[PDB]
Structures are given as structure tokens and as C-alpha cells.
RNA sequence: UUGUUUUCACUUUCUCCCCGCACUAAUGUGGGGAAAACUGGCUUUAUUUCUUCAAUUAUUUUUUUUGCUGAGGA
RNA sequence: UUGGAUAAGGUGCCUAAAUAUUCGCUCAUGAGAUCCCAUAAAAGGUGUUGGUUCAUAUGAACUAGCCCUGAAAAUGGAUGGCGCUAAAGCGGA
């Protein structure tokens, strides 16, 4: 496992309740699903979440479950579309991006760096709502529809990185980017 | 209640977290000192012996390292007694540095302040 | 960034294409010119059979897509050049002095008089494979042709710059020497 | 582990169900919105 | 409906700039990475800049992403489907003897030589020593006998 | 031909260093082919010989040596921190130093 | 880094790498020498690198100019400043990193029959975006007032030639040899003939 | 005023047919239709050394090569 | 004092440590580059990159990232210098 190529995104499920109190007995239980680097963050943004859209705060709450949750097929690539709030130097926009990998996890990855930059928004200014698996014939995003192609393939321009043992100071002769 | 409140002014300038049987056992066998002598006068010793745990916390039947383990780990009826007795754990600095001392655990950029929960004991392994 | 888009452009009948490494050779019966597209990443597919060249470019942004039809109208252009001359035939038009052209050296070199009455002669000269005549129909006229599109234009407008008219109200003197049509041979 | 194994499927496939059924309603309401 | 006998030789000498696309089932060399110096398979692509390959069981790489920039692509592919899983790919490769392919081209016989090589225990290297002194010997007998 | 190397070839850059501050406890050495931290880890436990001359004669001999040891790689580019018996002095760097086969 | 000298042909590298690099080889104490400085390329346009050389050289101290920054338009001399700015040369072991340093513009006499390295880490080629623009030195050199780019490049196309002729010779005897070699290869013992195919001799 | 149920739409082809019928980036291709089921998925039985038995956490036990240090003298 | 490991901050050279990995953005004929900190605005752009809402893959209107104009001072000159554009710049990981 390459953990120079694996990111600290992972998806929690989290069931949260107020307190029972003498006026209710039993308070409406909330449930969310949270990206976060772990659980301990994902908790976090369950109560910011809590507090803002009910008037739950942590201090009159309680944990009822927090779980990762695990693709299903971690090897399988599908399309994913995701609906986004983030707030910039002078407003607030949702923007709706598509993305498309193995895990749900790795597209949120893929969003927080293209969030960055592309808006210079950061993770704090970001807020993540309903990203779902989209179907092929749903895709919107023309840099996505090109690589849903019958039979997809192209070149391979990209210039060689080999390792450091290789990657000597003094060379023989010019190398070539062509190679391929 | 007291404790949580007296924390909660001092977060930023601490990190804590849950710290499970085997980091408690770790932390009490390899970086575990204690007040031997007579009161306000206690000169922190090293255990390498029961002999001064059962001296100071026999009262209590707590004549054991692992007495002590088990009264930290879960909070049983001699627990400010055991602490009190345990002196300050002086940690070395974590093995592979901190994220950002500055900013909290909590934050998505990287941090480290704030209430770590069971995060806490790769950093005190780290750290002992 | 679009993975592949190509465009495709058809060889006239009497030409012969060479491109190697986006270096590219068109010979014709009115002579040969020679492009270097090296400033562009594209993939050129000469097909010398069935005729027609296509320009692939891979992974292209919108900024480098809009050279693939640049290149495409160069080569269209290099193709029906060498097979018809291109010509610009020139107006010289003037209020009170006659402009007096001369063409020496062999259809090069044309040499104007009596702009705007100055009595001093101002010559240009002709890019490589270009010819400058008179046209035999009206009187002032000039033709200006050759195989090269660039060249041609380049030195039509060399022409009109030379014959620029300086510290008079332009809109009002209006003597000099005009591209009045662009056609091919 | 099997009876373990259907149930563990069962209590996943509800949360999403759950979160699917979350979607569309909010969908709807924003189509609602929408004339 | 057909091509005579213009399309072997036409299409043959086509010659295109660019050979070894990144199709599912293009055998690539892993020069970067804990897998570095491993030959894998692309077995579909994810992104522009990512793809997954799954060397079959026989080269030691699991099935993974990995971005493509790490990835030298070789010659040789094979004709896979679009999803193909591991045991069919196994199975192709297998039938298809492609690894057999790529270790006689110059680049595989050139990585068994190096390996072997490498691995060279002292008195073997001193064999190899020993050999090239007498070659160097007959060479320079035959060489001076050829003035 | 003749006087066999067993030995590795090094080179002596600075000492153990920051910006504008110095540990001269610690030399940074650079050995030949070695260019990542796993392969200057090979080199941990082995000897080093400073060999210098000398413009006249301490024991009957030109010549004499300063001992040390590689202690742990440094950094990620295969350079090693070595202590000798005594500093080795900064006339001395960027000269050759052999990390010794033994132990 | 450990040999005698290297030479370093400086065609088609950028000139803060090259430098750079440079610098590091000579503070460490391996002697180089750099050939062919008039090829070295830089980023961004002729443009704007003679406008950059322009506000260098209305850099002077009004005072006296003699005193102040000297310019140097050889592309060779160019690429000893820049590496000397890489460097602490106000010291005596960055004074003697510096002098270690040799820089030519073409191949003269004893380094054009040498072989020659290439830094790959500051090859044009590899550092460099196809769609973004750069220079030549000898080109701005020749705009700044150096005005020995032709005669370089005339020296140049001698050199070719006779390293053409040389490499002929070259490949005439390797093949030689490589055949001497198949021929002898059959009189040697077995045993030598497989511990050589083994190993791949 | 929540659950429950239903519809179609989702796949590979180194398959076939028609149209452009060589038009492609292509050792093929664009559009329009069929085919089973190699591929992909599922259901049973035996095996896990052909192959896999991962990752994280909790709880334990080791291991390669090695740096520095030796206070004291009961 | 001897070892170890870190903080702040850095790892192209000066300068110990990444010309590290991974994903985007940017070309500046006065690019940009660490709190304090060593200035920049109103107003603009058919530069390019994403989004949003309307009109049968086209026309609009917005929106905000980087870039550009607005942007002139006196000894010669300063992201600290060199220099850097497949960054050694900007936003992340």
C-alpha cells in the first residue's frame, strides 16, 4: 500500500440525539455523513452541523453511533456527482462538480484540491451536501463525458519520474521525452 | 463537570485524549516516577520496586504497578490518590514532529490542540 | 483539455506533400514552398495515397485547439498557392500628381515617383518569390504574385506602407497605393 | 458468519436508502421552488 | 466491402508517431513507487492522470490506482476486455504468453541480465572476470595475426 | 594492478549544521554510489579513515589518519554524519575519506 | 563529484538549473568545466531577458563606474556570474569553489576531445512547457554587445565535421572489434563461453 | 401521514446486418438494428500453497543492522 | 557537557534538509513569492479557468480564481541575492 499516493479522507455515519429533557422524552435523532480526515473531525462537523441547522449544541447532545463507512467496491471506477455550499472573499455560492473515481472519498480528495485551486477556497470555507453516484448517461461535465467514451486511449506524454537511485546528476547523453 | 470546565480555558494550549489499557501500562512502565518522601518534600523517584507504592498507597491496597495501572485506566475509587502519587509524565518530543501546534486537531488544516480522543496514543507513543 | 481533436484537409490534385517532423515541403507547378510548424504540439498524418493530411493535437486546451485550423488554412493556403499564383492586384489612386511606377530588376524593386509631387524616389522591394508588374488592362494598376501567400500580402503591404502620407489631414488626402482585390492566377 | 453478514448488509443498504430518499426530497422541494 | 491488397501493406507502413496507447490491457513498467521496477497491466483508466493495473498474480502488483505519470508504457498488449477482472486477465496472459514476448525484446533481456547480474555471488563474479581475461587473450591472438 | 581498495570513496562536506550555526561533532559525509536514506543506512555501523598528509615526518611517516564512525544517515540523498576520535578540521572539506569494509 | 573534472556541454540547459547545480558539484570541491555557453537557454522571452539585461546594465555607481558592477557580455562569463551569485564567494572556501569553475564559449582545444555530460535536471527539454516561450544567450549576448555569436558558430561547424569524421572511424573499428569478438568467441573453453552468455557478455 | 410495492435503464464483444460503404485517432471508424452471455453479476458443492486471506483498531510476542553512554565501588 | 528527538520555520544554490510526491491555476513588453512587514483604490478587460440563472449547441446576463490596465521621482538596486515558468510562483494534499 503506497501511503505517499493515499489520501486522509474517509466517509463516517453519525447518529447524534439531544438530551432528553422533562419537556420532550425522546428527541428526533439526526444522522449524517461526514468526510472527514477521521472520526474525531467528522464528530466535529456532525455538532457544528447540529448547532446550525437545529439548535442542538454538543453540551446538550449526545452520541448515539459513529461508524466509517467503506466503499463497496473499492475498485471500481464510476462517475460522481457532487453538490457543494462554499462561501468566497465576497459571497456565498453552491456549485454542483462531477468527478469520477473509486471511492467517495477520493472524489471529496479530488474536490477539496480543485476547490483550491481553482477558487483558492479552503476546507474551512467549504461545505459538502448530497454527493451521489450519477450514471454515465447523467454526466453533465464535458471533461467527464470524453472519458466515457466506447474505447478510450491516447498517448502517454508525460515525462518520466523515476527514482532517486535513478534520477543520477550526470548524464551520458540527452535523454528523451518521446521514450513511447 | 469541574474538570471538563477547567479544560475547556486551557484547550489551546494542550492536546488530550482516551489513552487505552496498553499506552497507560506503557506510560506507567517506562516513563512512570513517583513523590517517595514525606509530604511537600517527595524527591521523584523512578518505581523499579513496590516497595514505595505500597508504602504511600498500601492504605488504599494499592501495592502494585499494576494496582495503579488499573486504577488509572478505569477510574476506580483510588484515582486522585494514584495520580497525585504518579509524578508528572515528562514526555519526549513526538518522534515524527507535530502537524501545526498552532492550530487545533479539530481544524481541517492541520493541527494539533484541542481533545485528540483515541488519537491520543499513537501521539503518546510517539511521544514516550 | 479535450483528449484528441483533428481536422482533416484534402491534397489537390496537382501537388506533392512531404512533412516530416511537422516540417513540411508542397511543390506545384508554380514552384515549392517550405512551412515549419515546429512552434505547436501536433501530430500530422500525411496520407499520401488516398491524398489528404490530418492535424492531431492530444490533450489540447482551448488556447493550442485554436492553432489546429491556423494550421490547416496555411497548408490550404501553401496548396492553392503552388497550384494558382496568388495575386493582389493594386490601386494606385491620387488627386493632383500622378504616381509614377517603374518595375525594374526583372519584377522587383518598384520604384514610385511623384507622390504627392515630392520628386524623390521611393523603391521597395520584392520577398523572395514574389513578382511586381503592371496590369495590362488599367493603367493603375499593379499586380503583385507568387506562390507564397505570406510573401505576396507582405509585399502588397510593404507598398501601401512605403506611400503613407504624413502631417495632411488623411481622410482628406487621399493618394497612395491601395490593395483593391486579392484572387489567384 | 453469515446471519451476521445479512444484517450488516441490511443496516447499510437502509442508511443509504435513507440518504437516497433524503436526496430526492430535496430535489423535489427545489423543483417545487423552482415555478 | 473490402480492401484488396492495398491495407496490409498501407496500414503496416503507416508508421504512427505515436505507438503504445493506454488501452485496458497495455503491459507497462513501473519506475516509480514501493512497485518500481515491476511490470503491470492497465486494466481501465479512471482519470486523464490516473489508471488502474492490476499485474496479474504472476508479476507480484496487486490491482490498484496509480497515476499514469508513474507508469513507462512497453510494446506489447494484450486484448483484454474494458473490465475485465484478475483470474480472465491471468488467464489471458497466460494464454497469450505476452511476459515471454517482453522478456526476449531488448529491454527485457536487458532487466533479466541486470537482475542476474546483480544478484551475482563474488566467486561467479570472478568467473565472469576470468572468462573475459581468456576472451581478451583471443582476441588479441587473432587480432595480431590479422596484421 | 597492484595496492587493492576495499574500500568505499567519501567525500567530507561541512559538519553537522543549521543556517549560520555549527555542531562540529558531527561530520556530513557523501559516499560514492549511494544517493537515498535506505542505502546510506547500509553504511552504519562501518569504520572511516581520514587519511592525510603531511609536509614533514611524525613517526618516521608522511601520512597519518583520523578515526571515526558512521552513526545514522542524514537527510533523504544518501549523506551520512560520522564522529571521530577528535573534529576533523574544516581545511579538510570537500577531501576524500574511505568508509572502510569493516566491521 | 568524484572525478578529476567534468565537462559539462551547456547546450539547450536553463541557466538558473544549470547554475545551480553547478554551484552545489563545486562547493562540494568536484572541478567542472562548461562548454558551449553560448546555447544555454532561459526562460521566458528574448524580450524580456534584454530587458532584464537592460536594467542590470543601467546598474552602475554614478560615482564611478569603474567601480561599479562590470557587466561581461560573454554568454560564458554570463553563466560565471550567475554561478558565483550561487555562491558565497566572499569567503575563502566559496573563492576557491568559484575558481574551480571553467567556462568556454564553443569547445576549445583540449575539451572538445572529452567526453562530454548532460545535466538532466535542467534540460530545456524536460523543464520547460512546449508552448512557453525562451532564449538563446548567444542571441542575447549578440543584443546586449557581445558580438562573437557567427565566429563562434562558423568554430562549431568545424568541430562537427571533424567529430564527425572521428565518430566514423570510431564506429568502423567498434564493428571491427565486435566481430573480432563473435570469431574469438567460439575458442574460448565452454565453460567461459556459458558463464559469459549467462551473464550477458 | 412513515414504511410497503411497481415500471425502464444500466454490460462486453477480437459477433452479425444495413447505411457512409474506408468515411477512423486506430490494426478501423460514425449512424441505425439484431445476437449470446466469452466478458461482468448472482445462486450451489469442495479447496485456499494456482491464487487471495487486505486495511484500520484493540490486544500480544519477537526480529536484522547499528550510534552514544558506563555514574558507583555498598 | 554527551547523545536523541522536536518547536517556530524551512528542504534549487547561497544554507542543514525534497530540483520530493500528488491535484489544479497562472505568462505578466515593469509576473509572483512567509503574520508584524515594509502601500495600493474606485473603475475596467472579447486573457484564461471554473460556476449560476435564462433563451433552440448555440446567444445572453451575472459570478469569482489567477493574470492584465488603472500604477509617475529623483546616486545604481533589490521577493535578502542568484535566479526560477514540466516553478524554485499561487491554493491545497
Redesign the pocket.
Given at each position: 500500500?503506497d501511503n505517499?499516493?493515499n489520501?486522509?479522507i474517509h466517509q463516517y455515519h453519525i447518529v447524534g440525539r439531544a438530551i432528553p429533557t422533562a419537556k420532550d422524552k425522546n428527541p428526533n435523532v439526526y444522522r449524517m455523513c461526514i468526510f472527514a480526515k477521521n472520526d474525531t473531525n467528522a464528530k466535529s462537523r456532525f455538532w457544528y452541523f447540529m448547532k446550525k441547522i437545529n439548535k442542538l449544541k454538543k453540551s446538550n447532545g449526545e452520541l448515539l453511533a459513529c461508524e466509517q463507512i467503506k466503499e463497496r467496491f473499492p475498485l471500481r471506477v464510476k462517475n460522481y456527482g457532487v453538490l457543494l455550499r462554499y462561501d468566497?472573499?465576497?459571497?456565498t455560492?453552491?456549485?454542483?462538480?462531477?468527478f469520477r473515481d473509486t471511492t467517495k472519498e477520493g472524489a471529496i480528495?479530488?474536490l477539496?484540491?480543485?476547490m483550491?485551486?481553482?477558487?483558492?477556497?479552503?476546507?474551512s470555507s467549504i461545505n459538502i451536501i448530497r454527493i451521489s453516484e450519477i450514471?454515465?448517461?447523467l454526466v453533465r461535465?464535458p471533461?467527464i463525458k470524453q472519458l466515457l467514451?466506447?474505447?478510450l486511449?491516447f498517448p502517454a506524454?508525460?515525462?518520466p519520474?523515476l527514482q532517486?537511485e535513478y534520477?543520477k546528476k550526470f548524464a551520458s547523453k540527452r535523454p528523451s521525452?518521446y521514450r513511447m | 463537570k469541574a474538570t471538563k470546565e477547567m479544560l475547556k480555558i486551557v484547550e489551546p494550549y494542550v492536546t488530550y485524549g482516551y489513552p487505552?489499557?496498553?499506552?497507560v501500562?506503557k506510560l506507567l512502565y517506562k516513563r512512570g516516577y513517583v513523590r517517595v518522601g514525606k509530604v511537600r518534600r517527595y524527591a521523584r523517584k523512578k518505581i523499579q520496586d513496590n516497595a514505595d507504592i505500597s508504602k504511600h498507597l498500601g492504605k488504599y491496597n494499592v501495592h502494585g504497578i499494576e494496582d495503579m495501572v488499573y486504577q488509572l485506566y478505569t477510574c476506580g475509587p483510588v484515582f486522585k490518590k494514584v495520580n497525585n502519587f504518579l509524578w508528572a509524565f515528562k514526555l519526549?518530543?513526538?518522534?515524527?514532529?507535530?502537524?501545526?501546534?498552532?492550530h487545533a486537531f479539530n481544524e481541517?488544516?492541520?493541527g494539533d490542540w484541542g481533545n485528540r480522543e483515541?488519537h491520543i496514543?499513537?501521539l503518546i507513543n510517539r511521544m514516550i | 483539455?479535450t483528449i484528441?481533436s483533428?481536422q482533416?484537409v484534402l491534397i489537390p490534385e496537382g501537388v506533392k506533400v512531404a512533412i516530416n517532423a511537422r516540417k513540411v515541403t508542397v511543390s506545384g507547378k508554380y514552384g515549392t514552398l517550405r512551412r515549419s510548424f515546429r512552434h505547436l504540439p501536433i501530430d500530422i498524418?500525411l496520407?499520401k495515397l488516398?491524398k489528404?493530411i490530418?492535424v492531431?493535437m492530444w490533450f489540447g486546451?482551448?488556447?493550442s485547439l485554436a492553432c489546429i485550423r491556423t494550421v490547416c488554412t496555411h497548408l490550404k493556403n501553401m496548396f492553392t498557392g503552388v497550384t494558382k499564383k496568388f495575386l493582389y492586384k493594386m490601386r494606385l489612386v491620387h488627386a493632383h500628381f500622378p504616381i509614377n511606377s517603374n518595375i525594374v530588376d526583372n519584377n522587383t524593386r518598384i520604384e514610385i515617383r511623384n507622390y504627392l509631387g515630392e520628386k524623390s524616389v521611393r523603391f521597395v522591394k520584392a520577398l523572395p518569390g514574389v513578382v511586381i508588374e503592371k496590369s495590362p488592362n488599367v493603367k493603375d494598376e499593379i499586380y503583385v504574385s507568387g506562390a507564397d501567400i505570406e510573401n505576396v500580402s507582405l509585399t502588397a503591404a510593404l507598398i501601401h506602407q512605403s506611400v503613407l502620407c504624413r502631417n495632411k489631414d488623411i481622410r482628406k488626402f487621399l493618394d497612395g497605393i491601395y490593395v483593391s482585390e486579392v484572387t489567384t492566377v | 458468519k453469515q446471519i451476521q453478514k445479512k444484517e450488516l448488509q441490511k443496516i447499510n443498504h437502509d442508511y443509504y436508502?435513507?440518504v437516497a430518499?433524503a436526496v430526492k426530497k430535496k430535489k423535489k422541494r427545489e423543483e417545487k421552488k423552482?415555478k | 466491402?473490402?480492401?484488396t491488397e492495398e491495407?496490409k501493406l498501407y496500414?503496416?507502413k503507416?508508421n504512427?508517431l505515436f505507438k503504445r496507447?493506454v488501452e485496458p490491457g497495455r503491459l507497462c513498467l513501473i519506475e516509480?513507487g514501493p512497485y518500481a521496477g515491476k511490470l503491470c497491466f492497465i486494466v481501465d483508466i479512471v482519470?486523464?492522470?490516473?489508471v488502474i493495473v492490476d499485474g496479474a498474480?504472476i508479476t507480484?502488483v496487486?490491482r490498484m490506482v496509480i497515476?499514469?505519470?508513474?507508469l513507462k508504457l512497453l510494446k506489447e498488449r494484450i486484448?483484454?476486455?474494458?473490465?475485465?477482472?484478475?483470474?480472465?486477465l491471468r488467464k489471458t496472459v497466460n494464454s497469450t504468453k505476452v511476459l515471454e514476448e517482453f522478456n526476449n525484446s531488448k529491454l527485457g533481456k536487458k532487466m533479466i541480465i541486470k537482475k542476474k547480474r546483480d544478484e551475482a555471488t563474488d566467486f561467479e563474479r570472478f568467473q565472469v572476470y576470468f572468462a573475459k581475461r581468456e576472451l581478451k587473450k583471443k582476441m588479441t591472438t587473432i587480432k595480431n595475426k590479422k596484421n | 594492478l597492484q595496492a587493492v581498495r576495499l574500500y568505499e570513496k567519501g567525500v567530507i562536506?561541512?559538519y553537522k549544521?543549521?543556517?549560520r550555526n555549527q555542531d562540529p561533532?558531527?561530520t556530513?559525509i557523501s559516499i560514492k554510489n549511494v544517493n537515498t536514506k535506505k542505502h546510506a543506512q547500509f553504511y552504519?555501523?562501518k569504520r572511516v579513515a581520514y587519511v592525510y598528509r603531511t609536509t614533514k615526518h611524525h613517526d618516521g611517516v608522511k601520512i597519518k589518519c583520523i578515526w571515526g564512525?558512521?552513526?545514522?544517515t542524514?537527510?533523504?540523498?544518501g549523506?551520512i554524519?560520522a564522529?571521530f576520535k577528535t573534529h576533523i578540521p574544516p581545511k579538510a572539506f570537500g577531501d576524500r575519506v574511505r568508509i572502510l569494509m569493516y566491521? | 563529484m568524484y572525478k578529476k573534472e567534468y565537462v559539462i556541454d551547456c547546450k539547450g540547459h536553463?541557466?538558473?538549473?544549470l547554475?545551480?547545480?553547478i554551484?552545489?558539484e563545486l562547493?562540494n570541491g568536484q572541478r567542472i568545466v562548461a562548454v558551449r555557453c553560448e546555447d544555454i537557454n532561459?526562460?521566458?522571452?528574448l524580450?524580456?531577458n534584454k530587458?532584464k539585461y537592460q536594467?542590470?546594465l543601467?546598474?552602475?555607481?554614478?560615482?564611478n563606474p569603474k567601480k561599479?558592477?562590470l557587466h561581461l557580455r560573454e554568454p560564458s562569463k554570463?553563466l560565471w556570474?550567475?554561478?558565483r551569485?550561487?555562491?558565497?564567494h566572499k569567503?575563502y572556501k566559496?573563492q576557491l569553489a568559484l575558481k574551480k569553475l571553467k567556462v568556454c564559449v564553443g569547445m576549445p582545444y583540449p575539451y572538445d576531445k572529452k567526453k562530454k555530460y548532460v545535466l538532466p535536471?535542467?534540460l530545456r527539454?524536460?523543464?520547460?512547457?512546449?508552448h512557453?516561450?525562451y532564449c538563446r544567450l548567444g542571441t542575447l549576448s549578440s543584443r546586449v554587445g557581445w558580438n562573437y555569436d557567427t565566429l563562434v558558430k562558423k568554430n562549431e561547424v568545424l568541430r562537427k565535421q571533424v567529430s564527425k569524421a572521428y565518430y566514423k572511424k570510431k564506429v568502423n573499428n567498434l564493428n571491427e572489434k565486435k566481430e573480432i569478438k563473435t570469431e574469438a568467441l567460439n575458442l574460448i573453453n565452454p565453460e567461459q563461453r556459458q558463464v559469459l552468455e549467462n551473464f550477458g557478455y
Open positions: 500500500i505517499s499516493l489520501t486522509n468566497s472573499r465576497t459571497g455560492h453552491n456549485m454542483y462538480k462531477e480528495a479530488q477539496y484540491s480543485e483550491a485551486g481553482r477558487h483558492r477556497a479552503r476546507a450514471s454515465s448517461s461535465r471533461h467514451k466506447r474505447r486511449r506524454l508525460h515525462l519520474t532517486k534520477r521525452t | 487505552t489499557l496498553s499506552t501500562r519526549k518530543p513526538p518522534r515524527k514532529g507535530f502537524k501545526a501546534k498552532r481541517p488544516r492541520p483515541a496514543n499513537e | 483539455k484528441v483533428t482533416k498524418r496520407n488516398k489528404y490530418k492531431v486546451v482551448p488556447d | 436508502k435513507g430518499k423552482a | 466491402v473490402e480492401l491495407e496500414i503496416s503507416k504512427l496507447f516509480y482519470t486523464i492522470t490516473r498474480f507480484g496487486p497515476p499514469l505519470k508513474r486484448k483484454i476486455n474494458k473490465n475485465c477482472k484478475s483470474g480472465f | 562536506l561541512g549544521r543549521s543556517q561533532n558531527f556530513l552504519v555501523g564512525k558512521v552513526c545514522r542524514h537527510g533523504n540523498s549523506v554524519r564522529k566491521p | 536553463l541557466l538558473g538549473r547554475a545551480s547545480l554551484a552545489k562547493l532561459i526562460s521566458g522571452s524580450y524580456r530587458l536594467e542590470f543601467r546598474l552602475r555607481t554614478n560615482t561599479g558592477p554570463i556570474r550567475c554561478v551569485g550561487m555562491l558565497p569567503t566559496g535536471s535542467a527539454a524536460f523543464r520547460l512547457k512546449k512557453r516561450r
